[PDB]
Amino acid sequence: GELKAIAQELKAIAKELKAIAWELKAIAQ
Amino acid sequence: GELKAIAQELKAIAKELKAIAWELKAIAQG
Amino acid sequence: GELKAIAQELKAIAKELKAIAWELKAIAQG
Amino acid sequence: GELKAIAQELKAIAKELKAIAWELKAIAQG
Amino acid sequence: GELKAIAQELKAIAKELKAIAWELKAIAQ
Amino acid sequence: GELKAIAQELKAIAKELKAIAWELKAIAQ
Lengths: 29, 30, 30, 30, 29, 29
Prior knowledge:
6 copies of one chain form a homohexamer.
Chain A: H1 2-28
């Protein structure tokens, strides 16, 4: 239901932030 | 319902973070 | 209600991330 | 109530993202 | 319980965004 | 249950933002 859907969107948000962290690491080197 | 509306705004947030990741990749790769 | 208030703050968060994406595009040079 | 507390933290998050957008605008140079 | 735990993680998120704002200000010189 | 799962994803989000702050600190030095 809707609470699982919320947890799944937060998982997608964490995944995009992981990608941002990786790109910033690239910029840092 | 309001819980679906919350899930939809989180989807929009994930979409903007994807765009930010792409722009950071652009900055990283000139 | 409080659930609508939560959805509205998430909308404001999505709006600020959109602005950040645009500024990063500017930094990237377009 | 706990739901109001959640909305208030999301408001603080939107405020920090606004500050980040402003700093990025400074870096962008407009 | 779980709703207080959610508010507390959002507080930690606001704190990390404050740190990011500070680092960006440093980069901005 | 689902509310704990939401708190756990927010914890993962705070962790990724901490990593982003750390990479930006690296770039700042």
